[PDB]
């Protein structure tokens, strides 16, 4: 069966026909280890990123690209963020890059901030409930988004499959958090350009549209002071 010819014939994207699309104690150990959710309204363009301390084990970076809406951030804006100044010497980044020039400019950003790309996580969008306008340079219909994983310093698949969200809904699939947390990378986790709707235990969320804040740098640091400084987020709490 040729699902590409089938898409041409019917408008059902090939991913519509993927099927099926216990590490449960790990999920409970992650939940037990999670810091309280903390969050801060901040205009990241005008904000001294160095105020966010301590340095982070994981950064999830979700800048609002113009292609999500068909204040947006260009790759010019994003590339000038001083991410290396808040990343721990051994740390990870997950950068949502969209499906256009971001696949190139996001890799430039990663190298500029001192990371090497280790995984390319693809969010593949089905259209089972509505079997598309085109970017001028596009050759094909764009039905996916990429989240690049970078590493600096010394159970899951690289695919997320969900239905294409309703127009104007810019949310990324919550499954990205599951993937990240299952890596057991450390407990200092930062989500830049998060929203009220993405706030989550175990994470510090920083974004312009947050309606409330509870962030306190001293209180936050206290979650990771000894004996808790090097926990992976996947082990038991220390008595």
């Amino acid at each position: 069966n040729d699902y590409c010819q089938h898409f041409v014939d019917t408008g059902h994207r090939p991913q519509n026909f993927i099927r099926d699309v216990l590490i449960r104690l790990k999920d409970e150990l992650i939940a037990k280890s999670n810091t309280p959710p903390m969050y801060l309204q901040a205009d990241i363009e005008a904000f001294d990123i160095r105020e966010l301390t301590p340095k982070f084990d994981v950064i999830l970076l979700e800048p609002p690209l113009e292609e999500y809406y068909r204040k947006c951030w260009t790759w010019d804006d994003i590339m000038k963020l001083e991410i290396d100044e808040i990343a721990a010497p051994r740390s990870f980044i997950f950068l949502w890059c969209g499906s256009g020039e971001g696949l190139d400019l996001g890799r430039v950003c990663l190298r500029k901030w001192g990371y090497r790309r280790c995984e390319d996580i693809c969010w593949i969008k089905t259209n089972k409930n509505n079997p598309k306008t085109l970017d001028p340079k596009a050759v094909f219909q764009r039905t996916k988004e990429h989240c690049l994983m970078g590493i600096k310093g010394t159970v899951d698949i690289d695919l997320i499959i969900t239905e294409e969200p309703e127009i104007g809904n810019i949310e990324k699939p919550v499954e990205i958090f599951h993937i990240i947390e299952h890596f057991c990378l450390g407990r200092r986790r930062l989500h830049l350009f998060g929203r009220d709707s993405t706030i989550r235990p175990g994470w510090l969320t920083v974004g312009p549209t947050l309606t409330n804040s509870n962030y306190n740098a001293e209180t936050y640091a206290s979650y990771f002071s000894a004996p808790n400084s090097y926990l992976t987020g996947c082990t038991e709490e220390i008595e």
Partner: protein, 201 residues
């Protein structure tokens, strides 16, 4: 000359200037992916020096990449004069339509580059995800040839580092595991004889 054509050769040493211009180029190169090699790889410098630029004036390049070739392939694409304008991923399934480092890999990547100003192509007919069953190792899915034919029907195409199962109408396939030389396009036959009179490269 529409029917399949091929040239057994080492792509490092063949003079590709004799083949003319193509609307679509596809390559699945043996990148040096800094792992143990079941085949002979091309060094980064050899990949960079590939005479890709002579093969097209206006058209599309499909470049399969993996590992750190995701970055090196972008470099080569740009050095050869292309802008990357799409990226196809092939989601690997079994016969039951289920998906087969830090993460398990369910997919393969194919960069799409454009050179010049192609006109008369059918952009946007297909989408950028392929779902298809895995055949042999290192074997790409036949769906890509259909997408490429719908995008540019009837034009001349060339595949680099192809294998005998890859030979198709409208395509000239170059690879070191093909069966001799098989050429039917008269312009190509002429320039081949002129450049290789004793039939050896």
């Amino acid at each position: 000359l529409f029917p399949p054509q091929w040239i057994c050769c080492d792509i490092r040493y063949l003079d590709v200037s004799i083949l003319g211009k193509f609307a679509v180029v596809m390559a699945d190169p043996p990148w040096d992916i800094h792992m143990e090699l079941p085949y002979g790889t091309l060094t980064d410098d050899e990949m960079r020096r590939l005479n890709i630029p002579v093969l097209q004036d206006d058209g599309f390049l499909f470049l399969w990449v993996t590992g750190r070739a995701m970055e090196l392939g972008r470099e080569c694409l740009n050095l050869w004069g292309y802008e990357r304008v799409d990226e196809i991923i092939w989601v690997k399934t079994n016969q039951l339509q289920r998906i087969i480092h830090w993460l398990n890999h369910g997919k393969e990547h194919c960069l799409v580059g454009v050179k010049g100003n192609p006109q008369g192509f059918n952009q946007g007919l297909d989408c950028d995800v392929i779902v298809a069953e895995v055949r042999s190792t290192s074997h790409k899915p036949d769906e890509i040839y259909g997408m490429i034919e719908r995008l540019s029907p009837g034009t001349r195409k060339i595949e680099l580092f192809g294998r005998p199962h890859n030979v198709q109408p409208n395509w000239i396939t170059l690879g070191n595991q093909l069966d001799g030389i098989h050429l039917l396009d008269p312009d190509v036959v002429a320039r081949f004889k002129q450049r290789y009179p004793d039939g050896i490269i």
